[PDB]
Write a protein that binds this ligand. Structure first.
Ligand SMILES: *[C@@H]1O[C@H](CO)[C@@H](O)[C@H](O)[C@H]1NC(C)=O
Ligand SMILES: *[C@@H]1O[C@H](CO)[C@@H](O)[C@H](O)[C@H]1NC(C)=O
Ligand SMILES: *[C@@H]1O[C@H](CO)[C@@H](O)[C@H](O)[C@H]1NC(C)=O
Length: 148
């Protein structure tokens, strides 16, 4: 994905084990939470590079299969919409875990069977105050009406 060299202002404090998803306090690891200035924190993979004619490292927002972590995210996003995670949801393009980081995930934009998170969709609803629009393929609507 998008890659960026470590800058001296980075304060890396959280590393996540790739397969187990164990979080630990550490400044250094294969997958570390990187917070670029102003940007939202992201779990990024340390990657070996050549740069200015020398061997070096960069940090890339690469895809990671979180299935083996055995723990659910707090939010997900896909196709230009960000939504609260509700149990029963499929895996979307990215997953936000509550300690505080986005993960580039292995899913798409199908939120439930036959139900896509699509900005051009035909159903408007909300989850815990957060608005979203769905495209449907009876069909259960996995969200609440906008009327209070
Ligand atoms: C996720 O990572 C893959 C490479 O593993 C990259 O091609 C893709 O663009 C990334 N997705 C996002 C949303 O950054
Ligand atoms: C992620 O790993 C799990 C097995 O633990 C399985 O769903 C599959 O191999 C992977 N999922 C995707 C979408 O690649
Ligand atoms: C969001 O709303 C649903 C139903 O209205 C509720 O079951 C769920 O607990 C709410 N989520 C949070 C984080 O409050």
């Amino acid at each position: 994905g998008s890659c960026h060299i470590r800058q001296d202002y980075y304060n890396i404090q959280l590393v996540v084990e790739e397969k187990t998803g164990v979080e630990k306090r550490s400044i250094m690891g294969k997958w570390s939470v990187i917070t670029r200035e102003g940007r939202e924190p992201k779990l990024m993979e340390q990657i070996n590079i050549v740069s200015n004619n020398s061997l070096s490292e960069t940090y890339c927002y690469n895809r990671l299969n979180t299935s083996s972590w055995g723990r659910q995210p707090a939010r997900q996003r896909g196709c230009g919409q960000t939504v609260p995670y509700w149990p029963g949801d499929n895996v979307l393009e990215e997953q936000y875990y509550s300690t505080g980081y986005w993960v580039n995930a292995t899913g798409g934009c199908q939120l439930r069977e036959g139900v896509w998170l699509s900005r051009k969709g035909n159903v408007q609803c909300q989850r815990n105050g957060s608005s979203l629009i769905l495209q449907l393929a009876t069909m259960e609507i996995p969200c609440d009406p906008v009327e209070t």
